[PDB]
Structure formats: C-alpha cells, structure tokens
Scaffold this active site. Structure first.
Site, PDB file in Angstrom:
ATOM      1  N   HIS A   1       0.660  -1.055  -0.028  1.00 37.01           N
ATOM      2  CA  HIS A   1      -0.121   0.156   0.275  1.00 37.01           C
ATOM      3  C   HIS A   1       0.671   1.361  -0.032  1.00 37.01           C
ATOM      4  O   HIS A   1       0.399   2.117  -0.223  1.00 37.01           O
ATOM      5  CB  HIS A   1      -1.295  -0.084   1.193  1.00 37.01           C
ATOM      6  CG  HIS A   1      -0.353   0.654   2.332  1.00 37.01           C
ATOM      7  ND1 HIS A   1      -0.398  -0.313   3.562  1.00 37.01           N
ATOM      8  CD2 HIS A   1      -0.307   1.764   2.911  1.00 37.01           C
ATOM      9  CE1 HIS A   1       0.075   0.269   4.526  1.00 37.01           C
ATOM     10  NE2 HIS A   1      -0.183   2.102   3.822  1.00 37.01           N
TER      11      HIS A   1
ATOM     12  N   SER B   1       3.712   2.910   8.045  1.00 35.98           N
ATOM     13  CA  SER B   1       3.535   1.444   6.904  1.00 35.98           C
ATOM     14  C   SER B   1       4.463   0.931   6.522  1.00 35.98           C
ATOM     15  O   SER B   1       5.742   1.904   5.951  1.00 35.98           O
ATOM     16  CB  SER B   1       2.068   1.610   7.103  1.00 35.98           C
ATOM     17  OG  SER B   1       1.182   1.924   7.103  1.00 35.98           O
TER      18      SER B   1
ATOM     19  N   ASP C   1      -0.046  -7.487   2.070  1.00 35.20           N
ATOM     20  CA  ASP C   1       0.576  -6.273   2.487  1.00 35.20           C
ATOM     21  C   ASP C   1       1.884  -6.557   2.419  1.00 35.20           C
ATOM     22  O   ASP C   1       2.904  -6.412   3.361  1.00 35.20           O
ATOM     23  CB  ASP C   1      -0.277  -5.462   3.171  1.00 35.20           C
ATOM     24  CG  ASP C   1       0.273  -3.868   2.599  1.00 35.20           C
ATOM     25  OD1 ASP C   1       0.653  -3.299   1.789  1.00 35.20           O
ATOM     26  OD2 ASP C   1       0.133  -3.659   4.068  1.00 35.20           O
TER      27      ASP C   1
END
Ligand SMILES: *[C@@H]1O[C@H](CO)[C@@H](O)[C@H](O)[C@H]1NC(C)=O
Ligand SMILES: *[C@@H]1O[C@H](CO)[C@@H](O)[C@H](O)[C@H]1NC(C)=O
Ligand SMILES: *[C@H]1O[C@H](CO)[C@@H](O)[C@H](O)[C@H]1NC(C)=O
Ligand SMILES: [Cl-]
Length: 231
Positions: free
Chosen positions: A40, A177, A85
């Site tokens: 992402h 992230s 992810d």
C-alpha cells in the site's frame, strides 16, 4: 510511532525510508539490493532512502535509491483489508554496509506470542493529528494473541501478526507502514494497518508476517519463476 522515543542512531541500519506520491512509509533492507515494504506504500514516484536517521541532519552515508524491480502478490483477496500487504523491491543500485546501512535477513521462524518486538519509523508520534518526527521513533511492543486483532478488526488479513501493547499506549501509526517489526532480533513483520487513532487499548498493529513469505521472497530474488505468495 506513538509512545516511543528517538531510535538509537545505530539500531536501525536496515530501516528504509520510503516516500511515494503523497506518502511516507518505512521499509526494510533485506540484502544489499532489495527492500521489503507494504504494497500500500506504492503510491507512485517511489524514492527509497537508506542510512537515514535524522531527516534534517543527513547521515554521511545516506543514500537515495529507486525501484528497479517491483513485486507483490497476485493472489490477494478483496474482502479482507490490504490482504498480503507486502512489496518486494529491487533497488536501482546496491548499497554497501556502512555505519548506518546493513541488511536484516529473513526470519528462521515466526515469533512466539508474547515476544518483545521493536517497532520503528518516521510516522506520526501523535494520534489523532499528525506530528511527523525528524528522527525515527522506536518502541517495544509485543506479539499479541492473534485473537486480539480478530476482535478489534473485522476483515483482518491472514498471513499477519498482531502486535502492540494490549493496554495500548505504544503503537505504530500513520507513516510507519511498510516498516519492520523486529522480534527477538528477527525481521518478523511489515506494518500494514491498525486502528486510528493509534495506540488505543486492544487496537494493535497488523503486520504482514514476513516468515510466511520467505519462500516467495527467495523464489523472486533467486531467479523468479512466476513465484506465488503464500495463501
Ligand atoms: C475491494 O474492496 C475495496 C474496499 O474494501 C474497494 O475499494 C474495491 O473497489 C473492491 N474491489 C472491487 C471489486 O472493485
Ligand atoms: C485533530 O484531530 C482530532 C480529531 O480527529 C482532534 O484532536 C482535533 O480536534 C484536531 N485538531 C486539533 C489539534 O485541535
Ligand atoms: C503521484 O502518484 C499519483 C498516483 O499514483 C499519480 O497520479 C501522479 O502522477 C504521481 N505524481 C507525478 C506527477 O508523477
Ligand atoms: Cl502471487
């Protein structure tokens, strides 16, 4: 990272800083030419910085790199949140080991529930309301019983670890992230998702479980057939 402190300048030699169109992420240098991050985080025009600590006091050995190869899973589901992810990137040029650059390799096993893990990143240190630090922040959290994340997050992806502090207070957050969850000295997670606001009780981070992806990573780097991600 919420509830942490400035990382030691030497404790994150594998930590990559990933910038993409309108976005901050971390990543992990897994060898001298390859970085793992969250898929992402691929928001366009990616630049990957190695050997960074202070964004405003550039380490002498800091480097900018770009994706030359880019891989992610083609067997993802749409009904879970950010399934698989993970994105594996080959850098345009290798990076040699230096004071602030060194890879962190693949885990030999997944971490036990209860393990202490380090989280790190240049993500917000407040939540809600972004406060982006100049230096990466680090905290110690734990591998939590996966059921804690299942309770908190309907639609949690599989091949993930649940990690945080059951009582909250320390957590990764927006901008972290793609960064590593390091447990017992092993690269175990890539931060994917979590509750916002961050660091809430029983709303831990969800980290793609690196161990599960070992064979995929190795297949890709060592010559790639059309390698398949773990189910
Ligand atoms: C999959 O779900 C996401 C929201 O969770 C949505 O944005 C996306 O459009 C969905 N995929 C499809 C069928 O377009
Ligand atoms: C920042 O966002 C949150 C709510 O999302 C809240 O603390 C506050 O109203 C906002 N702005 C500030 C700093 O007052
Ligand atoms: C930044 O990324 C977005 C989404 O991927 C894209 O639309 C845009 O073209 C990128 N920026 C530029 C000007 O290359
Ligand atoms: Cl795949």
């Amino acid at each position: 990272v919420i509830g942490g402190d400035e990382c030691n300048i030497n404790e994150h030699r594998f930590l990559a800083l990933v910038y993409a169109n309108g976005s901050l992420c971390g990543g992990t240098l897994i060898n001298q030419e390859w970085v793992l991050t969250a898929r992402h985080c691929d928001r366009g025009n990616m630049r990957i910085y190695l050997g960074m600590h202070n964004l405003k006091v550039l380490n002498k050995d800091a480097l900018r790199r770009f994706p030359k190869e880019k891989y992610f899973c083609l067997n993802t589901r749409n009904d879970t949140i950010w399934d698989k992810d993970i994105m594996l990137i080959r850098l345009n040029r290798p990076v040699r080991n230096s004071a602030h650059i060194a890879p962190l390799s693949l885990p030999s096993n997944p971490p036990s529930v209860g393990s202490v893990c380090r989280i790190m990143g240049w993500g917000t240190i407040t939540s809600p309301n972004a406060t982006l630090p100049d230096v990466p922040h680090c905290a110690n959290i734990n591998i939590l019983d996966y059921a804690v994340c299942q309770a908190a997050y309907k639609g949690l992806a599989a091949t993930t670890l649940c990690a945080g502090i059951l009582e909250g207070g320390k957590d990764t957050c927006k901008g972290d992230s793609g960064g590593p969850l390091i447990c017992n000295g092993q690269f175990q997670g890539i931060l994917s998702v979590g509750g916002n606001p961050c660091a809430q009780p029983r709303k831990p981070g969800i980290y793609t479980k690196v161990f599960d992806y070992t064979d995929w990573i190795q297949s890709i780097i060592s010559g790639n057939t059309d390698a398949t991600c773990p189910p």
